[PDB]
Amino acid sequence: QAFTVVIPARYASTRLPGKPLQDIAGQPMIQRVWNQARKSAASRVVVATDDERILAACQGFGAEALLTRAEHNSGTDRLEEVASRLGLASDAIVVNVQGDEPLIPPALIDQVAANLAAHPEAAIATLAEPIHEVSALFNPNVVKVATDIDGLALTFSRAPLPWARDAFARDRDSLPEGVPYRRHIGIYAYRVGFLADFVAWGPCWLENAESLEQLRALWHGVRIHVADARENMLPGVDTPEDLERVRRVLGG
Amino acid sequence: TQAFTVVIPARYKPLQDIAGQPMIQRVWNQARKSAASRVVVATDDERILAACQGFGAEALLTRAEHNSGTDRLEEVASRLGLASDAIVVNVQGDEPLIPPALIDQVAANLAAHPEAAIATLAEPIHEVSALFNPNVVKVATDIDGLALTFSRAPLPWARDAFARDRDSLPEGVPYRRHIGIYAYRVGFLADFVAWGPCWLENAESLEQLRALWHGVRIHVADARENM
Ligand code: NA
């Protein structure tokens, strides 16, 4: 199954200026992400950036790259611009791989693309991982997801979902035994035609409240397939300390 | 336009205790004033059975092993000899404030929404304390009124609002309490009990999540009049 990887790479970040160009053991972070993407089954990998300096760096190490619009209000918006410019067919599959995930396993990229292909009833496929800490469950910065028996998302929420009634009434310092809590991993495969729907709809109140763009799809009745990540997804990069962590993994 | 049977599942809370009548009697009073062709109490407790017959209600004693009102309710539909396409309305015994119009409403909604196996109802939440109260069931729906999920957790989460103040209700967010009333056909009840309990239902103690778990859709409508 063919699919295209798009890697969004935005220059500005509050706590890491020129974030995609920060060095990780001799290569800029964006190059590390692109290297991971090249290990996947992708038919094509394109960097989508909002800054000439990143475009130049990317072309400098061999990556296909283009300059987008700086003012996209969401990641899906940015993907739509790229898919449209590349002229991808509406039934083609595009996988969004964030430019600040240098440790992303290629198998996870393949996984979402494979899953979307296998689930015609869904317009989006994405991944989840087990939650092990109760504090993470009650952490609004951690996105929880619940699915049906076939893996279609019921919803995504920053709220402690599902609620363990008896367990939490008894103790909120421990994870309810046997209840498979899932944290959403923001790697997505999209059918290109969905991107056009997304842009035509615009923001909805549910999405705005949770601050979760994937709820726009759910609100409009589009289905999202969710699967347990085939292997572990290490945290991405937002801060100087994250860079240090990732450098150690890669020998720098 | 279509006929329906009301079944009230009561588990041994319903006895009673206010104001002068059982909660279950208040529910029954509401139900028999609806357009229901018949109202039956379903219980597995002989004390509850005796109490209901004691105020004039038709009551059936079900097997003790049922793990949900809907299971208990399926035994009754079977015993009443209802056709598989017959509509049953589950009015839970903990909803004494349900006016008969709501009962009529949920039955009508089921017939109007073939895309869903279950019709149910919701009302607005005006108190932030209710959001953070596990005893209050919240529901979120999509644009076509189909449930996304049901949860005792504060759903949906208003990120910016709750980061500022957990103790006031977020503006411009239509919070909904799920009303404990369902319409479904007898045929569906059979499938429901055959599914058996799932982990999601067991965790939230919300039987309707069994339907969501197995991929069927639930139509949610705002209650046509206040409780
Ligand atoms: Na009496």
From Swiss-Prot, chain A:
EC number: 2.7.7.38
Compartments it resides in: Cytoplasm
Swiss-Prot/TrEMBL catalytic activity: 3-deoxy-alpha-D-manno-oct-2-ulosonate + CTP = CMP-3-deoxy-beta-D-manno-octulosonate + diphosphate
Gene Ontology molecular functions: 3-deoxy-manno-octulosonate cytidylyltransferase activity
Domain of life: Bacteria
Entry keywords, A to Z: Cytoplasm, Lipopolysaccharide biosynthesis, Nucleotidyltransferase, Transferase
UniProt enzyme class: transferase
Protein name listed in UniProt: 3-deoxy-manno-octulosonate cytidylyltransferase
